[PDB]
Every structure is written in C-alpha cells, then in structure tokens.
C-alpha cells in the first residue's frame, strides 16, 4: 500500500512518544485503527484543523494527494472487514455528537459508508448518561471485553471520539496446552517472576539479528497477519527501539526461512488505554481538540471541538484458538541441538497485515503480569 510507510513512519512515533512517557507499564496499540480514526474525523475539518491532523499522521502534503490519502485506508480497511477472513478481529469508532447540533449529512454519510464508522447523537447535558451510553457501545461491540471505558468527560463535552480493537488470532502453527507450565519472566536483572510460558520445539522464521541486536521471531496467524517479536540482548532494548525501520520489518517478512529452535513464549493478555488528545497532541495534532477547531464539514453553524478521544486495544495470545480446525501439519526438524529463544524478559512486537503491509499492532511487554 502508497501509505504503508506512513502508517509504519506513524506506529514508530507513536511508540517512542509512549516509550518516553514511562518505561514500566506494557504498551499496546493499533496505529491502523488509531490512523484509520483521523483520518476519517479530517473529513469533518477543513483548513489548518485538516492539515494538522494529516502531518500528524505523518504524511506530506506538499507530496501526496489527499485523495490518495484516502483511498488507502479505504483500501485498507475492506482487508481487515471481509467476510472469509478468519483474523477474529473486532474494531469500532464511535462518534458521539450532541443532540441538539445541527450535523451535516455528508459527514454522517462518509464516515458510515466509507469509514465503517458509526454517530450517535447524545444528550451531553447528563454526564453520566453519556458516558454510560458510551461504554455500552464499546462493551457490545465487543461482547463484553473491555467495560468502563470511559471513566470522565469535561463540562462542556459536546463531541466524543472512541476507538476500539480486539485481537485474539490463531496461530496457523500452534502450541500444545500440555506444554504450558509456569516459569521466570526477568523483569529486572536481579529480578524474576512466574508467568505461563507456551513451548514448542520445530521450525521457527527465527534468527538473530546483528544490527538491532536481538531475536527476531515471525509467527503468521490464520488469515492475513503475521506477528513479529523482537528480543533485545541484554542492555538493548533501548538500543532495538531506537534502530527500528518499516525497512527493516519489510526486510524481514520477505524471508521465508526457517530454523529449528525451542520457543518458549508467555501466554498473555494485554490492553493499553490512551488519552488520543494527549498522546497524538504531542505529535502536533491540536486544534482539532481546541475551541480554535474547524469542524464546519461536521456542523455548518455552531462551534465544535472533540473534547474527548480514548483508544483501548486488548491482545490475547495464547497456544490456539478454536476447538478444531480439520487440518494437520508435519514438519521435518534436524536431530541437533536447537536453540532455546526464551521470550522470558521485555520484548517488543508489531502485528502486520500480510496484504497491506500495514501496522495493525505495536506494543512492549514489559511484565505479562
């Protein structure tokens, strides 16, 4: 895709910003659905308020058509919403408008048909009320994964912006639950902890690499994704965040080789949840969130700004999926001794749609606890 390397320019900034924040807590986000979010609202913009909210995306305007723009992420988002696709992905934007404003119907139109997004029209007068009809949403949508979303909204909250991921794949080489045991996660070096730890012995996309200086492991999903984890040697992690490049990861999924190791990798479900005007105003998207915004293409005659604006992406891994799946590999591995690749301290990862290219996650596990 034309805008694969912006999206991968954007997960990158997006990930260093959080990174800085605090090193401590696991991050986990989709840059596609956060990007994919944005760039639906700039419809609603016009003027600086637009232009901002591109570059900040990380796209030059001066270089690429706004069109082309939005032709990707519609390219994109019928890969990840098809029929046949066994991704077991689920993902909203909920835009919530104060009853009371006048919309403007092509806004509504466009977001709906083009961006699979959905509005609603809410009473902001009762805090409460819009909070809880909020959370609803999210909590249906996703069959009861992620509840209280929403914890506040300001007194003068008349537009709200909520953007949620799910993500639990099956692995299309998977995991024997019988080799599931506890064991030590570093999450000092002086320092261990107990978590599940999966394991296999066969034959892995895995190889450690000279210049980011760490393992770099390539586990494919059923359907159109790819996983890619990243374990830093000893002392570089921050090293391995650092030296990270879309062409780096493009490298590495044109490989096709495979290696035989033992791989012990932690069973894990993760969210992270973000205050978007925080985070993406560092990045320099503001005036969307300011009284100053131009949101005209949403509402012709009364002010707007978005006040309100959270993400919540939740990963689960674990050995596999479903029940059953009709189907039955053998692979052939070399009787010599293969490495043992612990995924047992902090790792980096990012999920990567097979078609696109594109960065449907990124994230850091710091303590799977």
Known sequence: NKITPNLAEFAFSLYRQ????????????SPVSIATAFAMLSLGTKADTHDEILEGLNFNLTEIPEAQIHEGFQELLRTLNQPDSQLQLTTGNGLFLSEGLKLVDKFLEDVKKLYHSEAFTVNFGDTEEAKKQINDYVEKGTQGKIVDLVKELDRDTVFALVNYIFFKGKWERPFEVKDTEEEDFHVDQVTTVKVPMMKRLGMFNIQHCKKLSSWVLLMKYLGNATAIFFLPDEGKLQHLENELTHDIITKFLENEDR??????????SITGTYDLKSVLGQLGITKVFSNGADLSGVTEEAPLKLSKAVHKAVLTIDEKGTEAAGAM????????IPPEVKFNKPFVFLMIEQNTKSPLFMGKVVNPT
């Open 18 to 29: 959080l990174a800085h924040q605090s090193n401590s807590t696991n991050i986990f986000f």
């Open 259 to 268: 290696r035989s190791a033992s791989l012990h990798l932690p069973k894990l």
């Open 329 to 336: 590999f053998l692979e052939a591995i070399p009787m010599s």
